[PDB]
Design a protein around this ligand. Sequence first.
Ligand SMILES: *[C@@H]1O[C@H](CO)[C@@H](O)[C@H](O)[C@H]1NC(C)=O
Ligand SMILES: *[C@@H]1O[C@H](CO)[C@@H](O)[C@H](O)[C@H]1NC(C)=O
Ligand SMILES: *[C@@H]1O[C@H](CO)[C@@H](O)[C@H](O)[C@H]1NC(C)=O
Ligand SMILES: *[C@@H]1O[C@H](CO)[C@@H](O)[C@H](O)[C@H]1NC(C)=O
Lengths: 206, 98
Amino acid sequence: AYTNSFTRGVYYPDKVFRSSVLHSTQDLFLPFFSNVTWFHAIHDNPVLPFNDGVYFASTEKSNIIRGWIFGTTLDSKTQSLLIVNNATNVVIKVCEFQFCNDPFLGVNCTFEYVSFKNLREFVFKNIDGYFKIYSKHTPINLVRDLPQGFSALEPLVDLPIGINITRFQTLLALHAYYVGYLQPRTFLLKYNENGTITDAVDCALD
Amino acid sequence: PLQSYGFQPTNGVGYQPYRVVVLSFELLHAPATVCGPKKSTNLVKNKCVNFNFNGLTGTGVLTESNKKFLPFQQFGRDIADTTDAVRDPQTLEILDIT
Ligand SMILES: *[C@@H]1O[C@H](CO)[C@@H](O)[C@H](O)[C@H]1NC(C)=O
Ligand SMILES: *[C@@H]1O[C@H](CO)[C@@H](O)[C@H](O)[C@H]1NC(C)=O
Ligand SMILES: *[C@@H]1O[C@H](CO)[C@@H](O)[C@H](O)[C@H]1NC(C)=O
Ligand SMILES: *[C@@H]1O[C@H](CO)[C@@H](O)[C@H](O)[C@H]1NC(C)=O
């Protein structure tokens, strides 16, 4: 399936801020007005590609998803990073684990770290060995589509790991998400009087 | 081969148990590891002065400000890489660079 990635793949280009400008740059980005693939939360865990960082979102308020499954070959012979939602701390472990056709939790270690009306909109990217956490928790009103609107993304945490680009599985629990990829496009942004992104334009769109 | 330590200090100084550490340092590809707390000096206002911040640096006068930030900024420039605004990394208080 596919839906329309209208505008919302946009983040602050670095830990770094101007005010009231129209500044241009380039990085890996979700391109504007492109297709973005839509999937289900049935009962599954399908196979999806991962192309140099993704724009990820899902409409939820009740902790359906639990995190992301990383690892270069994902069968306990790999340097596997893990993201676990706890409802207390988003914890990160870099170890070896055992994975199945449905590895989740429901109803050689080298690195450790401890920290519907809503959209938890996350972007992971891995430039030069640096794994970065770009986020936005925004409230919305409807459920079936990404709205015609605008959003910005903010940084949380840098982490030096350097492992994954090809593919993955993901986490669920027993009791719908958006996924769209990045590519190098030169842009033009806008900082407001506050220095938040309020509108931007992809150069290579039309 | 596993005959054990003879730590019976009735001998001289040559046979004494010592609280030893071995600092083993090598290099991999990920920087910004354990480093040193570089002494965290004071501030000054209303006089032109050299300054070095956490990576970026310059020279000028440091005064108050009306512009506002968010939880993430460490930098500030009005237009065309003319750096003018730093919220300080200790008091978390916004300043201008005239
Ligand atoms: C995805 O993009 C292609 C390229 O234009 C288009 O043909 C296709 O219809 C799009 N997908 C959907 C579901 O519209
Ligand atoms: C991981 O631990 C296992 C122990 O079962 C060991 O055989 C292996 O050499 C270790 N390293 C890797 C890279 O798998
Ligand atoms: C959150 O942190 C760890 C990881 O699960 C666990 O020990 C702790 O009990 C968790 N808190 C909960 C489940 O309330
Ligand atoms: C930006 O700053 C102005 C200061 O006059 C304020 O009125 C406005 O609400 C601020 N915007 C945000 C999103 O904080």
